[PDB]
Amino acid sequence: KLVRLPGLIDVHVHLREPGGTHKEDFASGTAAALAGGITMVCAMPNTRPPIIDAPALALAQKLAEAGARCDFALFLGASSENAGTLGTVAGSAAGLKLYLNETFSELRLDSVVQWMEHFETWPSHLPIVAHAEQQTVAAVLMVAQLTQRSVHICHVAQKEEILLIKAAKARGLPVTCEVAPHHLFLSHDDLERLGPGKGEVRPELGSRQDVEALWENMAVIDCFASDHAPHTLEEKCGSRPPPGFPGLETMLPLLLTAVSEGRLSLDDLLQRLHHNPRRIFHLPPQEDTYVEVDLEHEWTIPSHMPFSKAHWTPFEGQKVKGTVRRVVLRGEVAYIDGQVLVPPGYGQDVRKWPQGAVPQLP
Amino acid sequence: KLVRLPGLIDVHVHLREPGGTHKEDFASGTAAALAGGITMVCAMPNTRPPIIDAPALALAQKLAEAGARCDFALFLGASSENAGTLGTVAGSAAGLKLYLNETFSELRLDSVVQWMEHFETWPSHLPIVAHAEQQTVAAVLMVAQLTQRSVHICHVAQKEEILLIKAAKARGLPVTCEVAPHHLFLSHDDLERLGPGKGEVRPELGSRQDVEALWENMAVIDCFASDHAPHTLEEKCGSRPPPGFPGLETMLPLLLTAVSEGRLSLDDLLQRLHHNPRRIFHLPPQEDTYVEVDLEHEWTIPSHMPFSKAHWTPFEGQKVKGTVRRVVLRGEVAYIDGQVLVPPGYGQDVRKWPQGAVPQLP
Numbered sequence: 266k267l268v269r270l271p272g273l274i275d276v277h278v279h280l281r282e283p284g285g286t287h288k289e290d291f292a293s294g295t296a297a298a299l300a301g302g303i304t305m306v307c308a309m310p311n312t313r314p315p316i317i318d319a320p321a322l323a324l325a326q327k328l329a330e331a332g333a334r335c336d337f338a339l340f341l342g343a344s345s346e347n348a349g350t351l352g353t354v355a356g357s358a359a360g361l362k363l364y365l366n367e368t369f370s371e372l373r374l375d376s377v378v379q380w381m382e383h384f385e386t387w388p389s390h391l392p393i394v395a396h397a398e399q400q401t402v403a404a405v406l407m408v409a410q411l412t413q414r415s416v417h418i419c420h421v422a423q424k425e426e427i428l429l430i431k432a433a434k435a436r437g438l439p440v441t442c443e444v445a446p447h448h449l450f451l452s453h454d455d456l457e458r459l460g461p462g463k464g465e466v467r468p469e470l471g472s473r474q475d476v477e478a479l480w481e482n483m484a485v486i487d488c489f490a491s492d493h494a495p496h497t498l499e500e501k502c503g504s505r506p507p508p509g510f511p512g513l514e515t516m517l518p519l520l521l522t523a524v525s526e527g528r529l530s531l532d533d534l535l536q537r538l539h540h541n542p543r544r545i546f547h548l549p550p551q552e553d554t555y556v557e558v559d560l561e562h563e564w565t566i567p568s569h570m571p572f573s574k575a576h577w578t579p580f581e582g583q584k585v586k587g588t589v590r591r592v593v594l595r596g597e598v599a600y601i602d603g604q605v606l607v608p609p610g611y612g613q614d615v616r617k618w619p620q621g622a623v624p625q626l627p
Numbered sequence: 628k629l630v631r632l633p634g635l636i637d638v639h640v641h642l643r644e645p646g647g648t649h650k651e652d653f654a655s656g657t658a659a660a661l662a663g664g665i666t667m668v669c670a671m672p673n674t675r676p677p678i679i680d681a682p683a684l685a686l687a688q689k690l691a692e693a694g695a696r697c698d699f700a701l702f703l704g705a706s707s708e709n710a711g712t713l714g715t716v717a718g719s720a721a722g723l724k725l726y727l728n729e730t731f732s733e734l735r736l737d738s739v740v741q742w743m744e745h746f747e748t749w750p751s752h753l754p755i756v757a758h759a760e761q762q763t764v765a766a767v768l769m770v771a772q773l774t775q776r777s778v779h780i781c782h783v784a785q786k787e788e789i790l791l792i793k794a795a796k797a798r799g800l801p802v803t804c805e806v807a808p809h810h811l812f813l814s815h816d817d818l819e820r821l822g823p824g825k826g827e828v829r830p831e832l833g834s835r836q837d838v839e840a841l842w843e844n845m846a847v848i849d850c851f852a853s854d855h856a857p858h859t860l861e862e863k864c865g866s867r868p869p870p871g872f873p874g875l876e877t878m879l880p881l882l883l884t885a886v887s888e889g890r891l892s893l894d895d896l897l898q899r900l901h902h903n904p905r906r907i908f909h910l911p912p913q914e915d916t917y918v919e920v921d922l923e924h925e926w927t928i929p930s931h932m933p934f935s936k937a938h939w940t941p942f943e944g945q946k947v948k949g950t951v952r953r954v955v956l957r958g959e960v961a962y963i964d965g966q967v968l969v970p971p972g973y974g975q976d977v978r979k980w981p982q983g984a985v986p987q988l989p
């Protein structure tokens with residue numbers, strides 16, 4: 266007996282097209298998504314060229330419409346130069362992404378005044394998300410309060426971060442957050458196995474006490490999102506390894522294992538991979554779309570998953586219970602037992618759907 | 628220029644059929660819903676006969692399928708006799724409703740042990756909602772904790788109640804709540820105008836400080852819901868007046884006025900009348916469904932609204948800004964400028980849709 270789930274949403278993926286297509290492209294990344302039970306993804310803008318203006322957005326849109334196998338929205342990225350220039354295209358993007366620390370990106374904002382300018386000029390009804398580690402979470406929350414609007418915090422990893430967000434919610438402040446699976450299922454205890462190259466990620470892996478704090482404060486976590494960040498093994502094992510893990514194909518199996526162990530409920534899971542992603546980002550429903558999972562199947566994660574071009578995974582050797590058996594997307598069978606069955610280009614930009622626009626005042 | 632909204636959801640309405648059809652029936656109540664921009668309603672079980680067993684549910688389902696003009700789900704009601712007997716039909720209902728105080732109902736539970744039995748026997752993945760006033764909110768929250776599950780609190784009205792729920796959420800407890808428009812827009816200051824008959828409602832109208840506390844703690848309010856409780860003027864003005872107000876046709880106009888005044892944002896409104904109702908009750912999307920409102924139109928609420936058989940309203944004389952211009956439901960024009968255009972029976976039971984079942988473990 267299978268369980269039917271709605272079409273799950275991952276609001277934080279890196280599909281590397283344009284400019285890094287040896288790591289992943291729209292076609293391979295969305296195949297990995299479907300294989301992990303994900304039918305809609307929001308793609309980050311730290312590509313080459315980065316999606317920081319209208320021409321780059323236009324290019325990315327066509328590449329995604331031609332290559333994506335599942336549906337998608339594309340983030341715009343904040344730069345030191347583009348505040349106040351995105352108003353005509355802002356509504357066509359998933360939202361605006363701010364890079365406030367040193368990760369795999371050059372979209373550096375070198376002053377909190379630049380953060381303020383983006384919060385003041387980006388349309389107030391559209392989403393803003395921030396890469397903000399440790400004390401940076403408090404700093405960007407200050408900027409959100411000074412400009413009287415909401416903010417969403419990407420991949421929360423540490424006790425310090427989730428407790429701060431918890432205190433902000435208790436004061437009624439409009440903040441939401443997401444947590445990625447490696448920060449719930451990996452810790453410093455795993456760095457000896459992974460090694461210093463494979464183990465590079467931002468935010469870095471936390472302590473066992475960080476992981477325990479995230480689980481203890483599950484009520485504070487609005488979304489799960491993979492931060493699918495594919496790099497090749499050659500890159501991860503080389504002299505200057507880039508940070509990030511692939512994760513689309515492993516996220517739901519890991520979380521289903523936790524559900525079967527009683528660590529969280531099926532509803533807890535569906536709030537965080539469907540309902541809350543919808544409502545925070547104003548993402549539309551998907552007609553005739555659902556995911557069938559088998560909760561009984563026990564298996565061990567191999568050295569690489571079938572679809573991501575990253576061709577490695579930090580969860581190798583972990584035992585999981587639960588697997589994706591079939592995915593239907595808008596009335597067509599998209600995935601069955603390891604075979605993707607919709608071609609590149611089947612996926613659509615959900616912000617072009619009439620129901621996919623963010624409502625605003627005239 | 629109109630604003631397009633998604634199909635709004637009211638999770639707390641009384642449509643009085645079967646048994647009280649002089650107050651309202653499915654056809655008149657759902658016409659009032661469409662006129663107020665509501666495309667799906669959840670109907671309470673305190674009818675005559677009350678919906679407290681499988682035969683009564685079957686009857687109510689057919690009456691709704693034949694009379695409803697918008698889509699719907701039907702609550703089951705908890706009784707002193709039916710704990711442990713609803714398992715075969717539980718999944719077909721919106722949820723289980725507990726009447727824990729003395730309102731317009733005989734579904735009296737005369738012991739917290741009966742509350743415990745319902746929390747233990749109702750399927751753990753399906754919704755439970757409670758009419759729970761003042762200290763009863765704390766008592767039912769205790770029962771939810773003892774049985775390790777969630778609860779939803781109906782029409783929160785007082786500072787005491789919202790602050791208690793706020794403290795529970797700060798402790799991570801799984802509780803949600805709804806607030807009705809009369810407790811945001813009416814107070815003791817209005818009882819002299821209404822009089823003791825028309826003014827009877829449960830929970831009773833609060834003080835100006837109660838109303839200010841609800842607005843101050845908007846972040847704690849998960850849903851708006853009308854508690855549409857129609858009674859005739861003869862009944863409200865008679866010797867033994869029943870409690871309750873009609874409200875489907877006035878709820879969105881009142882809230883749109885508040886939005887135009889800057890008291891809350893359009894997003895705040897759509898979280899509470901669309902996204903959170905969906906996710907708390909696992910209600911499915913509605914294809915090709917939307918509501919067009921005009922935010923500029925200023926008008927005064929008359930002595931009765933066009934569609935509810937209650938033929939009165941406690942908001943008479945209040946000035947509002949905002950009106951529903953057009954509603955489309957599953958591809959058909961359902962309402963335009965005061966004319967309902969879908970017939971009785973157009974509406975469907977959303978729990979029969981494949982996407983409308985609540986997911987559960989096998």
Ligand SMILES: NC(=O)N[C@@H](CC(=O)O)C(=O)O
Pocket residue numbers: 279311368369396465466467468492494495507508509510
């Ligand atoms: N380790 C990561 O997090 N890597 C991400 C960037 C990011 O999300 O910061 C990437 O794009 O490679």
Ligand SMILES: NC(=O)N[C@@H](CC(=O)O)C(=O)O
Pocket residue numbers: 641673730731758827828829830854856857869870871872
């Ligand atoms: N005043 C009310 O609240 N009336 C409701 C009952 C209820 O919701 O308690 C009714 O059914 O009339």
Ligand code: NA
Pocket residue numbers: 329330331610611612613
């Ligand atoms: Na396409």
Ligand code: NA
Pocket residue numbers: 691692693972973974975
């Ligand atoms: Na019908």
Ligand SMILES: [Zn+2]
Pocket residue numbers: 368396419420467468
């Ligand atoms: Zn990041």
Ligand SMILES: [Zn+2]
Pocket residue numbers: 277279309492494
């Ligand atoms: Zn990222």
Ligand SMILES: [Zn+2]
Pocket residue numbers: 730758781782829830
């Ligand atoms: Zn009630």
Ligand SMILES: [Zn+2]
Pocket residue numbers: 639641671854856
């Ligand atoms: Zn009621």
